[PDB]
Design a protein around this ligand. Structure first.
Ligand SMILES: [Mg+2]
Ligand SMILES: [Mg+2]
Ligand SMILES: [Mg+2]
Ligand SMILES: [Mg+2]
Ligand SMILES: [Mg+2]
Ligand SMILES: [Mg+2]
Ligand SMILES: [Mg+2]
Ligand SMILES: [Mg+2]
Ligand SMILES: [Mg+2]
Ligand SMILES: [Mg+2]
Ligand SMILES: [Mg+2]
Ligand SMILES: [Mg+2]
Ligand SMILES: [Mg+2]
Ligand SMILES: [Mg+2]
Ligand SMILES: [Mg+2]
Ligand SMILES: [Mg+2]
Ligand SMILES: [Mg+2]
Ligand SMILES: [Mg+2]
Ligand SMILES: [Mg+2]
Ligand SMILES: [Mg+2]
Ligand SMILES: [Mg+2]
Ligand SMILES: [Mg+2]
Ligand SMILES: [Mg+2]
Ligand SMILES: [Mg+2]
Ligand SMILES: [Mg+2]
Ligand SMILES: [Mg+2]
Ligand SMILES: [Mg+2]
Ligand SMILES: [Mg+2]
Ligand SMILES: [Mg+2]
Ligand SMILES: [Mg+2]
Ligand SMILES: [Mg+2]
Ligand SMILES: [Mg+2]
Ligand SMILES: [Mg+2]
Ligand SMILES: [Mg+2]
Lengths: 100, 59, 124, 146, 22, 56, 77
RNA sequence: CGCGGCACAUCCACCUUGUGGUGGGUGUGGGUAGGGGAGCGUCCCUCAUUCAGCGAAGCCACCGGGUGACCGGUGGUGGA
RNA sequence: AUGCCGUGGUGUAAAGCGUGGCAGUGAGACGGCGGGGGAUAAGCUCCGUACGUCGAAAGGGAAACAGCCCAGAUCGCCGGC
RNA sequence: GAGGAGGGUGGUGAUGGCGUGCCUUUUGAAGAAUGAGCCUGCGAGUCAGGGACAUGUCGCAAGGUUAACCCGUGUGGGGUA
């Protein structure tokens, strides 16, 4: 069995026991989250219906909060003297799927 | 009545009376909508800028 | 106070030359040529982080289109069918079901084919 | 992460395409889509997927009567005045397999990997091919209706 | 005079809308 | 204290002709871009006393 | 080559014309119409001027009119 | 448009109600010449404090951190 | 017809104005529309245009392609229109 | 940890896409315009002055402030011209 869960404006194909990095949720480590689904597959049944899928939730457990890789930006246009240095670390959440 | 004006195209390359008429209607970017009244000063603004907006008689 | 330059100046020289390891020729060896190439490498990287969002979508659509034609429908009317049936699964996962579970992808085509109108060429 | 095929995942089969009353354009498209693997949902643009394609009856292909007369095939030798030209009609007399093969190679990508894709293509002028040790399933042009 | 005429006919494409530089 | 280009010893003549040598034109051997030339905007003897008022 | 030895010259533009339009509120002394000749004539509370300069004699509002074919400028106090 | 980080202007709330801080809306944030603002690193002096022949500087490598200039840890070399 | 000046309404934060500090610029280019010079030639040359873009503008389209068409890049995403 | 299965560092990169060096100077340069073989070290808005204008800030305030000079071990005290 697996579900397609919707979180952070993006979708993820998850099963019970999977570890997923998602966007930063405002929940602390050890708590529980309820997340909406877009499709649920249980073998040969696909359930595919907004009246039915709005009653099915995925239960997640927060493992903690990690960071993205370091991204380095050095903008440069050709013969201008224009330079701009910038860095970024995206903030993530690690999430064990327990529900479906 | 009361009109709904949605901006469809860009102000890049538009002229001064076309950009300032979109500024007085309250539009900011593409697909931004606004609700305004159907008085004579409003559809004179719409007549200037009707190639850049899509009007519908909505609530 | 006469100040020697080398303790300050070698700081950015060591970091440019470490970012250029694995370049060939003068581009991993010489600081002036390693730095011209780091300007291009971080512009190319910026340019390609915004391009691969379209590149992976171009990969997924190609695989949804291949799997739909096995199930005698085009990509064209499949996307119309899933919007008509209210299936909000994105193309990242629709090209992932098409590989790992081909039976569930056949079950999604039948939902898309049923919600499609009776004559698709008739006006709305 | 999306699916990327490993080394040892691609399963290659054998197809035979009868070329009796098919126009040269429709056949070259269907052979190029079948050699690359555009019909499999595990397609990756850096991977030689796709299947073996045998084209029999290459002398029979539907070419128009004014294309046999007037369409030209140009080759240059690097020497001054090395522009040598034939027509389609007199290449179908000599090498009708080379006409079908040239139409497919212009429809493949222009890269190193298409050089390993074109090694899975066999074109024969007659109705008979030597690859009966494999079992080429016959392939017909299908158009998925819309 | 052929390069001028050929570079000037390519402004009547669908994307250029009757206009090009030069 | 340092020396400017007019105070370093020597350096009066033009060291070679300006055109025809394939070298950069130089004008003096004690210009600040040379080894051993004068210092540009270097230290000179200063007094740093200020005029702080009596009430302050 | 020949030359345009007979042409090539001009005087300065003199900034002539209507300076205050109709219904516009003026002060005493304000110049209304600057012109050669009387393209416009004075009316009530308007004087001509030395080089036909049509100023204001009284604060008021500018109004244009017709008085037997001639077009006049007047002030309504 | 969606989800998440930052910055600036303005508005609304307050905590010594602008020297400021916190919170919440809306708006804005391509940029050469150029203008304004705020910072990083090297060196010397003064006051305070703290390391160092149980190994300072400088150098080399690996692992890490910051919105940038850049930083820190650990080890090798080394000798104030 | 437009444009211009005045005035009454309504709209619209980063409009306008006065006086100080510090500037840079004063070689423009092509495209649309109106005109002169030239042969109603020029990737010509000189003006007009609360016209546009480039200059100083990345991204998508025009095969390639400063000035054309779409659109103005705070950063991240293996989302969607 | 003996070998394999899964993950993870570090090195490498078959293959696919995209992709016209840096500076200076220009309407516009990847340009077949200019400068640069390479590395290390050096090489360009400073200083004087009771100067000038404008500002931030501190002291005194209808007043503010001394110059040369004098006395002191000094950065302190005198000194109204
Ligand atoms: Mg430039
Ligand atoms: Mg390498
Ligand atoms: Mg996109
Ligand atoms: Mg001398
Ligand atoms: Mg000399
Ligand atoms: Mg010396
Ligand atoms: Mg004193
Ligand atoms: Mg005149
Ligand atoms: Mg007189
Ligand atoms: Mg922007
Ligand atoms: Mg900016
Ligand atoms: Mg600047
Ligand atoms: Mg030791
Ligand atoms: Mg030292
Ligand atoms: Mg370090
Ligand atoms: Mg150490
Ligand atoms: Mg050490
Ligand atoms: Mg000013
Ligand atoms: Mg000029
Ligand atoms: Mg100049
Ligand atoms: Mg001009
Ligand atoms: Mg013209
Ligand atoms: Mg010209
Ligand atoms: Mg023009
Ligand atoms: Mg562009
Ligand atoms: Mg602009
Ligand atoms: Mg472009
Ligand atoms: Mg392109
Ligand atoms: Mg769509
Ligand atoms: Mg030139
Ligand atoms: Mg310029
Ligand atoms: Mg060159
Ligand atoms: Mg060259
Ligand atoms: Mg040279």
């Amino acid at each position: 069995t697996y579900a397609i869960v919707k979180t952070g404006g993006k979708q993820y194909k998850v099963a019970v026991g999977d570890v997923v990095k998602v966007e930063k949720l405002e929940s602390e480590q050890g708590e529980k989250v309820s997340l909406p689904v877009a499709l649920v597959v249980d073998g040969a049944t696909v359930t595919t219906d907004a009246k039915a899928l709005a009653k099915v939730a995925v239960t997640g457990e927060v493992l903690g909060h990690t960071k993205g890789p370091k991204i380095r930006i050095h903008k440069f246009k050709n013969k201008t003297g224009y330079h701009k240095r910038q860095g970024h670390r995206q903030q993530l959440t690690v999430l064990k799927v327990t529900g479906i | 009545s009361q009109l709904k004006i949605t901006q469809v195209r860009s102000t890049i390359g538009a002229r001064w009376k076309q950009r300032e008429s979109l500024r007085t209607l309250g539009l900011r970017r593409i697909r931004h909508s606004v609700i305004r009244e159907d008085n004579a000063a409003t559809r004179g603004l719409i007549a200037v800028v009707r190639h850049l907006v899509e009007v519908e008689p909505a609530q | 106070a006469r100040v020697k330059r080398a303790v300050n100046a070698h700081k950015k020289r060591r970091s440019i030359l470490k970012a250029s390891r694995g370049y060939r020729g003068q581009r991993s060896r010489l600081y002036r040529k390693a730095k011209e190439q780091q300007l291009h490498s971080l512009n190319y990287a910026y340019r390609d982080r915004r391009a691969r969002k379209g590149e992976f979508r171009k990969l997924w659509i190609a695989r949804i289109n291949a799997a739909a034609r096995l199930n005698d429908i085009t990509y064209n009317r499949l996307i119309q069918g899933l919007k008509a049936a209210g299936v909000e699964v994105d193309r990242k996962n629709l090209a992932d079901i098409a590989i790992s579970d081909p039976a569930a992808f056949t079950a999604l085509v039948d939902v898309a084919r049923a919600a499609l109108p009776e004559d698709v060429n008739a006006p709305s | 992460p999306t699916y990327a095929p490993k080394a040892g995942d691609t399963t290659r089969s054998w197809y035979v395409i009868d070329a009796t009353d098919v126009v040269l354009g429709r056949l070259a498209v269907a052979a190029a889509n079948l050699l690359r693997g555009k019909h499999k949902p595990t397609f990756a643009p850096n991977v030689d997927g796709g299947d073996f394609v045998i084209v029999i009856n290459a002398d029979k292909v539907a070419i128009s009567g004014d294309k046999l007369q007037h369409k030209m095939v140009y080759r240059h030798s690097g020497y001054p005045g090395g522009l040598h030209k034939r027509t389609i009609g007199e290449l179908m007399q000599r090498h009708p397999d080379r006409v079908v093969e040239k139409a497919i190679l212009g429809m493949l990508p222009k890269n190193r990997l298409s050089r390993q894709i074109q090694r899975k293509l066999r074109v024969y002028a007659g109705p008979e091919h030597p690859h009966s040790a494999q079992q080429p399933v016959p392939y017909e042009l299908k158009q998925v209706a819309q | 005079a052929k390069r001028g005429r050929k570079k000037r006919d390519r402004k009547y494409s669908k994307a250029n809308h009757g206009k090009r530089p030069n | 204290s340092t020396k400017t280009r007019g105070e370093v010893s020597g350096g009066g003549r033009k060291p070679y002709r300006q055109k025809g040598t394939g070298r950069a034109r130089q004008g003096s051997t004690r210009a600040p871009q040379f080894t051993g030339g004068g210092v540009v905007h270097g230290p000179k003897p200063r007094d740093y006393s200020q005029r702080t008022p009596k009430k302050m | 080559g020949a030359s345009s030895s007979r042409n090539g010259r001009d005087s300065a533009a003199q900034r002539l014309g209507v300076k205050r339009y109709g219904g516009q509120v003026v002060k005493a002394g304000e110049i209304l119409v600057r012109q050669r000749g009387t393209k416009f004539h004075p009316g009530v509370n308007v004087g001509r001027g030395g080089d036909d300069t049509l100023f204001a004699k009284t604060a008021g509002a500018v109004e244009f009119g017709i008085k037997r074919g001639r077009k006049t400028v007047s002030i309504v106090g």
